[PDB]
Design brief:
This is part of a larger assembly, with 2 copies of chain A (177 residues), 3 copies of chain C (172 residues), 1 copy of chain F (58 residues), 1 copy of chain G (324 residues) and 1 copy of chain H (162 residues). With 58 residues, chain F is an all-alpha fold. Chain F has 4 helices and no strands. A 3-stranded antiparallel sheet of chain G has the order 2-1-3, with helices on one face. The chains are: A mainly alpha (177), C mainly alpha (172), F mainly alpha (58), G mainly alpha (324), H mainly alpha (162). The complex binds phycoerythrobilin (10 copies) and phycocyanobilin (4 copies). Chain H: One of its GO terms (cellular component) is phycobilisome.
Chain lengths: 177, 177, 172, 172, 172, 58, 324, 162
Amino acid sequence: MLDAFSRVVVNSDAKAAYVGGSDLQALKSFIADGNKRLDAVNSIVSNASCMVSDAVSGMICENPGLISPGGNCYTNRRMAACLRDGEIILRYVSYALLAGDASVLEDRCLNGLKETYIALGVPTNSSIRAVSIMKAQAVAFITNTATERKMSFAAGDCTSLASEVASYFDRVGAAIS
Amino acid sequence: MLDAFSRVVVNSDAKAAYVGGSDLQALKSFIADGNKRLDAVNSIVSNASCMVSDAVSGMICENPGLISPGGNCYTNRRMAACLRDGEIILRYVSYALLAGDASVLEDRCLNGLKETYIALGVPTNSSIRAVSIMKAQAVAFITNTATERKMSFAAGDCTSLASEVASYFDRVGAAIS
Amino acid sequence: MLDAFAKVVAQADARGEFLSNTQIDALSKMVKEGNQRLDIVNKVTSNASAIVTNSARALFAEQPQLIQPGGNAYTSRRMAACLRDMEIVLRYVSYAMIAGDSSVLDDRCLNGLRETYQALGTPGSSVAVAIQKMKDASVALANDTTGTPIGDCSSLVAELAGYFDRAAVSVV
Amino acid sequence: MLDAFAKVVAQADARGEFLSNTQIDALSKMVKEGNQRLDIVNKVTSNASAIVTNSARALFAEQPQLIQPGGNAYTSRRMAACLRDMEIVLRYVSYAMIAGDSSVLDDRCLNGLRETYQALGTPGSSVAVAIQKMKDASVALANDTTGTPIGDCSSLVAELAGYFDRAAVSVV
Amino acid sequence: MLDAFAKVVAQADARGEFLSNTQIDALSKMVKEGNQRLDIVNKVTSNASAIVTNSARALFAEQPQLIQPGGNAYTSRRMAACLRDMEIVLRYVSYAMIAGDSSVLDDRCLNGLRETYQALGTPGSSVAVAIQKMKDASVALANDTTGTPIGDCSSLVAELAGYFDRAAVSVV
Amino acid sequence: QILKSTKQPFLESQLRFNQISIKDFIKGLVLSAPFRDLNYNVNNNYRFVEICVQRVLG
Amino acid sequence: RLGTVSGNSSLDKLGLDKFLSESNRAYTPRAQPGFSSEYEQIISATYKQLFGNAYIMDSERAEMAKQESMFRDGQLTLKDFCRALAKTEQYKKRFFDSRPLYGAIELNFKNILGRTPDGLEHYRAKSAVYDTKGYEAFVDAFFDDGEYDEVYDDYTVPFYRGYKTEANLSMAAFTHFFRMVRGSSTSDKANPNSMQKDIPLNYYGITKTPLAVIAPGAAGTAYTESFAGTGSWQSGRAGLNAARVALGVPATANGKSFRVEVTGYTQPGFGITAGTAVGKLYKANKLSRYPRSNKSYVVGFDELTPLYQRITKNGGTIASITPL
Amino acid sequence: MKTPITEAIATADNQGRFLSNTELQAVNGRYQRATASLTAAKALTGSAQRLITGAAQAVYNKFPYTTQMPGPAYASSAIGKAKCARDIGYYLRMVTYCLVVGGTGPMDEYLVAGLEEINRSFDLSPSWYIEALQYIKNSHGLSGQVANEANAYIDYAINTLS
Ligand SMILES: C=CC1=C(C)[C@@H](Cc2[nH]c(/C=C3N=C(/C=C4\NC(=O)[C@H](C)[C@H]4CC)C(C)=C\3CCC(=O)O)c(CCC(=O)O)c2C)NC1=O
Ligand SMILES: C=CC1=C(C)[C@@H](Cc2[nH]c(/C=C3N=C(/C=C4\NC(=O)[C@H](C)[C@H]4CC)C(C)=C\3CCC(=O)O)c(CCC(=O)O)c2C)NC1=O
Ligand SMILES: C=CC1=C(C)[C@@H](Cc2[nH]c(/C=C3N=C(/C=C4\NC(=O)[C@H](C)[C@H]4CC)C(C)=C\3CCC(=O)O)c(CCC(=O)O)c2C)NC1=O
Ligand SMILES: C=CC1=C(C)[C@@H](Cc2[nH]c(/C=C3N=C(/C=C4\NC(=O)[C@H](C)[C@H]4CC)C(C)=C\3CCC(=O)O)c(CCC(=O)O)c2C)NC1=O
Ligand SMILES: C=CC1=C(C)[C@@H](Cc2[nH]c(/C=C3N=C(/C=C4\NC(=O)[C@H](C)[C@H]4CC)C(C)=C\3CCC(=O)O)c(CCC(=O)O)c2C)NC1=O
Ligand SMILES: C=CC1=C(C)[C@@H](Cc2[nH]c(/C=C3N=C(/C=C4\NC(=O)[C@H](C)[C@H]4CC)C(C)=C\3CCC(=O)O)c(CCC(=O)O)c2C)NC1=O
Ligand SMILES: C=CC1=C(C)[C@@H](Cc2[nH]c(/C=C3N=C(/C=C4\NC(=O)[C@H](C)[C@H]4CC)C(C)=C\3CCC(=O)O)c(CCC(=O)O)c2C)NC1=O
Ligand SMILES: C=CC1=C(C)[C@@H](Cc2[nH]c(/C=C3N=C(/C=C4\NC(=O)[C@H](C)[C@H]4CC)C(C)=C\3CCC(=O)O)c(CCC(=O)O)c2C)NC1=O
Ligand SMILES: C=CC1=C(C)[C@@H](Cc2[nH]c(/C=C3N=C(/C=C4\NC(=O)[C@H](C)[C@H]4CC)C(C)=C\3CCC(=O)O)c(CCC(=O)O)c2C)NC1=O
Ligand SMILES: C=CC1=C(C)[C@@H](Cc2[nH]c(/C=C3N=C(/C=C4\NC(=O)[C@H](C)[C@H]4CC)C(C)=C\3CCC(=O)O)c(CCC(=O)O)c2C)NC1=O
Ligand SMILES: CCC1=C(C)/C(=C/C2=NC(=C\c3[nH]c(/C=C4\NC(=O)[C@H](C)[C@H]4CC)c(C)c3CCC(=O)O)/C(CCC(=O)O)=C2C)NC1=O
Ligand SMILES: CCC1=C(C)/C(=C/C2=NC(=C\c3[nH]c(/C=C4\NC(=O)[C@H](C)[C@H]4CC)c(C)c3CCC(=O)O)/C(CCC(=O)O)=C2C)NC1=O
Ligand SMILES: CCC1=C(C)/C(=C/C2=NC(=C\c3[nH]c(/C=C4\NC(=O)[C@H](C)[C@H]4CC)c(C)c3CCC(=O)O)/C(CCC(=O)O)=C2C)NC1=O
Ligand SMILES: CCC1=C(C)/C(=C/C2=NC(=C\c3[nH]c(/C=C4\NC(=O)[C@H](C)[C@H]4CC)c(C)c3CCC(=O)O)/C(CCC(=O)O)=C2C)NC1=O
């Protein structure tokens, strides 16, 4: 399973490259400000189930007829599966942040999620409308720009990694586009 | 699985006849030539470690692009598997000649190894160059004209039998083709 | 493409015998109810778009995420292609109504139609609602007694409801 | 297609080298038997409609369940398509007689022939017993001493049997 | 196919609103490279034979398997099959570079390339070196301002080499 | 020319097995040996183009 | 992500990473009291493993709140514990009663044994127990055989094993195994080849025919062709599937033949000018150009080049290409 | 299988058309002659063993060589006469299937297509079956419009053997 420490060793074994210290400086930049990844992960995994609390509630306020007859989150069984559907994919977003690659959301989640959501008739527009809501919901704990809450940080620019979650949120709508 | 003795039964079944003296004349001459075939397959299975030696170290000197970093026999599991993938397919034709029928080869392995192999990614032209390197490796041993090891048989001419193991191994190669 | 008459002929030929006396009056029953069956498909071809636009406006008022911006059937190139599928299955059930069987219906429409709806990403539970939205409107005019002499046409509209039910099953 | 001369071209093109001298004196043995090849294909295709209809007639005698109604070869569409495939194997065996190898018979006619028959449902054990009638009607046809002078062609009739038993084990 | 102007309209329709004014001056950076894209096409479309000669000059040298007797590209149509396949990975990248995305690159070349090499047995190992021998051959070839003024083009050298590595991972 | 000798009984069976298409079935009929000796040996190349655009392209 | 020789591993990117990472064995001969985060992880592992990653909520886990507690002293795992989970209402709601008998059999092998049965003589031995000796011996036909008492000793958890050469199933059982396993984000129901109402492998599991092993999550893996047999004995139709054989004069006219597998086309895409023809957009008979998608073709080697153009200029994605 | 009902469906499916008043008289005119054609099918069914064996003897009176000549294609033996009576029973069965469906559907599919491949292979003459069918044409003993429907599908079979 890939991470950014081992992204280069599946790159350099095309070259059979004994890694002299030129290409390793990005890994020495990965170990430089990986604390800002680490200080964002504790700002995610402690504030995790309030991301999904307004995900489908933010979806149903503008796409109202999925709790209507002929919806998709009509019953209690139809709705509670959707709240675990969104919380699984945000669990699998933040595996990739501390790892450093786009491994885990492709080799487990999107190795077959496009045929999943069309086997059930899960609407792909509303299952990216919530994740576009969960895009900007997941950047605000990294940014500390939130209307409601402040996390005890140190003050720098994490905008290299504030859009890296959005650079994981783009390829979750790769197949379910 | 079919036997040649079973082959005349279903021949005599949709015909709804009994067994006559007419088709019996093939099988009674098959009995007395049974020891000659029994003098064949014992030397096929007892020099099998040489035949899987020259299966894979011979095909790799005529395309060394698989031991290259990035090839399809590069790592030491795929190095281990190619030693293992060839020592089952000559074990199956040792079963197939005692029955005489190729259907035991067909239903066990030759129904569907081709559909796996392009999803396992291995090339088939490399395989049939490794299939046919066991083909002439086989037919030396049944006739006792092998160079570096000469074994104990009787005296005669098993070139009807030596075409039969050549009648198997092309269909081994045509299955992957 | 078989008929009701050709389905009982093709079962006879594979047995290799003539038609029995119980099978000719089973078909002589079927020809005297022919003007009932000609009066049914005259009702659902003289209203062959007033069924469809009133079934579309029923469904679009009920399910609102079809017309939403971003929807499956939102834009006007995916709106006539929604009304194309709502109009050919009203056509192809009415071919299966006049035949007496539905082997015209599944092979010319429904063979793998839920597999092409899988490839487009179409919600198929709502189109099965739209066939049921078309099914009761089709039997409300088949039961309409205007202009025709009055009799019993009971099992023919239960046959017509079975053709819509066979269409609405294999699209989800 | 490949004949026997096209074998050792492609059996040495991947090997890389030239044609070695120890192989071609076996191939100049084959042109001594070149005149005993072409009579023998002329023996088969002159009687090419008397080996087919004399062995389909002896097939339906022993197996009456194919021409009975509801059988596989019952109708006139499926009788003509039974005599079609009985002559198709008679072409591609005699194509392999003139060439010197099997590799046009089992590449254009036997590569999926039993899996054609498992999908259609024809008895694949029973096409082998029609072919083995045609084996015995042609090997015993190609041992006559009329039309040719006599001499031992016992080596070349085992090759004619060896493709007739190759279609006997292809179809089961 | 869709382009780099189309996706911010594809997220203006599938979201469903009007234009934000932050979506308008993000397109000013597209024409901050808009002239600077156009001379980058001149460094690859005027050197079409020049890269694909200089790369396959190198590729059989450290990897002599392709020219072996029994190698892949052995006959001259297979060696011409390399040259019609080396250029299209650069041609559709040259379609992708004037586009600004990889939609038409995935539409017409890439989707159907891993399995097509695997069915034919042409290796996935060495069709990535044909990316990589032209990868560094166009990093040098496009980084020079011979004819155009001098400034910042440090974005688009990480976009055409942001498309070769997309073609590298989509084939191995 | 829908005679018994001009029929193509092996090309007919591959259509019925859905092996080839209609476009591969029209291509087998112009390359059929009845179409050569009856419609291609008896006119030149400038009349045969008038046949293969009137019948094929319609 | 896609790759065969990308990092030397052929089947971690085929969808079997976590089915090859874990082993799921339990270490104590009875479950110790006091700590309830070390053996409840084993139960929710088996609640996705045996049910096939189906959603068991706690509203039905507390309906089944006896059968795991008797495992904690008194039952064995894999022999008795998931056997008790196979005799539930929740097991009978998904894999027994919404579907036919063979579909209940051929989904039980993925659930219990971790394989696909080949032919019908493996369907013969399992369905000779239901029609004679009920449902409870039908479920316990699996659990007391050589296929169950050898691969797992009784304190592991039953994994997937239908890809290895030590599991001597067939070569066709490989090809069915990636029809049944579509990554780790599917179920019995969230599977497009069969939902809960259907049967997975009706023809192909019986007749041992191998199929195109498509890597899941690929570009255009939303394809499966439908079924209609051809011929006049079985009164079938023609025009739905391309043939699986490629025999004849068009076998070796254009070289070696192939079978391609197109995902699907639409109405925008046919013209070579990037749009829709503004007009009536149809013919008079109101069908598409490809009036059902997910179609397939049989084509030789010397026309692979214009056919790969003609699919890809028209909006069709390709699943795979298999030679015939 | 062409019927009148599976032909007007096909021209409706060519034009994308709902079943108009044009296609509702092609299927109505089948119903005004399904009365007379189903009595003719019921009458030919009952008098089958009179008409089959009577036509098999009327062949042998016109062509007496067929009962005399040796070899397997002739009626000179017991099993040669049994296969001739099977064949007229195959021919007369497809006449009654056409009176049920109202057209020449079942004898197109099950009888006519592939027939000349058999009659050349097994050395069977097509004029042996004209004389068998010209017996059945003017010895079924029907009358009126019941005879008009049986005499339409009998000489459709004569014209595909001629
Ligand atoms: C129609 C009904 C309706 C809703 C339910 C909300 C749903 C909603 N929430 C957020 C957006 C958000 N939601 C959260 C979540 C939380 N904030 C916290 O700190 C808590 C711990 C946690 C639960 C309250 C955060 C951090 C953001 C981003 C910034 C913010 O709004 O605070 C966004 C913006 C996402 C985007 O830009 O696409 C939306 C639409 N808005 C609506 O219009
Ligand atoms: C097990 C738990 C555990 C952790 C999570 C880390 C905790 C941690 N976070 C940071 C440190 C930091 N975190 C931030 C981040 C930010 N500041 C902002 O206001 C932005 C909003 C946000 C950027 C996204 C910055 C800028 C630093 C200091 C630079 C650095 O990372 O060293 C540091 C370095 C400061 C120091 O040296 O003391 C440490 C130790 N260590 C632990 O032991
Ligand atoms: C490319 C690198 C390379 C090798 C690895 C060796 C391997 C090797 N051996 C043989 C050829 C052979 N190899 C054997 C096998 C054996 N002989 C015995 O008697 C033993 C019991 C047994 C185990 C060694 C036999 C019997 C032949 C045929 C020659 C002969 O002995 O008559 C061939 C020719 C087969 C062919 O390609 O068609 C090759 C390539 N030679 C090489 O050039
Ligand atoms: C009936 C016999 C029989 C077999 C052959 C195997 C079939 C088979 N072979 C391999 C797997 C393989 N087989 C080979 C072998 C070869 N590939 C090449 O490039 C060479 C042409 C050739 C050596 C001669 C290789 C290299 C692997 C890859 C192992 C891997 O991918 O990890 C696998 C995958 C194993 C797994 O995923 O666990 C299977 C099921 N099983 C059987 O029961
Ligand atoms: C216990 C183990 C066991 C065996 C190994 C075989 C042993 C065996 N081999 C042969 C006998 C024979 N085997 C051969 C075979 C060959 N001779 C050649 O010249 C070729 C090199 C080769 C294969 C073509 C021939 C020609 C005979 C003599 C003919 C015969 O009587 O079978 C015989 C019969 C005559 C005899 O008693 O010796 C027996 C019993 N049977 C067994 O039960
Ligand atoms: C003695 C008093 C007396 C009556 C007035 C009628 C009243 C009446 N009309 C209809 C029913 C009908 N009656 C007619 C007849 C006609 N419609 C016309 O426009 C034509 C002028 C006329 C003769 C062709 C038709 C066409 C229907 C069916 C239409 C409907 O659904 O009502 C029915 C139901 C079935 C029936 O019996 O016909 C009844 C009870 N019956 C009676 O017992
Ligand atoms: C060429 C086109 C064509 C038509 C449009 C119809 C029109 C039509 N219907 C009927 C005749 C009839 N039509 C019906 C049908 C019905 N009566 C009802 O009240 C129900 C609403 C409906 C049931 C479906 C009945 C029941 C009769 C017979 C009247 C009776 O019962 O006495 C008749 C009288 C003669 C006949 O039976 O055919 C005619 C001409 N027939 C045709 O041939
Ligand atoms: C265009 C078609 C065509 C043919 C079919 C052959 C036919 C043919 N065969 C022979 C000549 C012969 N042909 C045979 C053949 C046979 N004897 C048997 O017992 C077998 C039944 C049969 C083999 C199938 C023999 C034994 C000879 C004489 C020996 C010899 O050829 O020297 C000759 C005389 C010249 C010669 O001796 O070679 C000719 C013309 N040649 C042709 O040009
Ligand atoms: C009409 C067709 C058309 C072209 C063929 C190109 C050619 C071109 N480029 C530039 C203009 C430019 N071209 C470059 C490009 C480069 N400088 C570098 O350092 C790189 C090595 C090199 C890219 C290969 C830069 C950086 C500018 C802007 C000058 C500046 O930065 O001040 C201009 C001047 C007008 C302008 O600024 O847009 C023109 C005509 N642009 C076009 O519009
Ligand atoms: C590790 C990867 C992984 C996942 C991603 C999920 C994937 C997943 N989702 C659902 C299943 C589902 N998921 C949804 C969710 C939604 N539909 C909508 O319209 C909303 C927009 C959206 C919520 C955010 C719905 C409605 C179902 C169907 C439940 C049902 O059919 O009742 C199922 C079926 C489970 C079952 O019902 O038994 C599975 C396996 N599970 C996994 O193991
Ligand atoms: C290129 C060479 C070629 C081969 C190899 C071939 C096989 C072949 N045999 C077929 C059918 C058939 N083949 C048979 C033949 C038999 N079934 C029996 O029960 C008998 C044992 C046997 C006759 C003696 C029958 C009855 C059909 C079915 C015909 C139909 O369904 O229309 C079909 C379906 C199409 C058809 O002919 O109707 C194919 C493709 N076709 C070819 O064109
Ligand atoms: C629409 C755009 C398009 C694509 C994407 C395409 C791919 C494509 N590449 C092919 C072949 C090929 N491609 C190669 C190329 C290579 N093999 C190697 O080993 C080298 C590493 C590499 C570069 C030299 C070879 C050798 C073949 C022929 C395979 C064979 O004949 O064995 C073929 C088979 C037909 C043919 O020979 O052209 C297709 C369809 N063709 C197209 O028209
Ligand atoms: C041979 C007869 C035939 C079949 C079997 C068939 C299936 C079919 N339905 C299609 C589209 C479609 N079908 C629908 C229908 C619906 N979507 C919804 O939201 C509603 C629930 C439902 C109906 C109101 C829509 C919106 C499209 C267009 C989807 C697209 O273009 O991407 C397409 C794509 C091409 C087209 O525009 O027609 C095919 C091939 N088409 C045919 O002509
Ligand atoms: C339903 C469509 C259909 C038709 C038409 C049909 C004809 C048909 N007639 C046959 C034979 C035959 N048909 C006859 C009939 C006759 N010879 C005479 O001398 C009489 C004058 C004449 C009877 C009127 C005979 C003697 C044979 C046997 C030929 C043989 O065994 O070689 C055979 C050979 C198989 C057999 O019956 O043993 C076929 C296939 N089969 C069909 O499935």
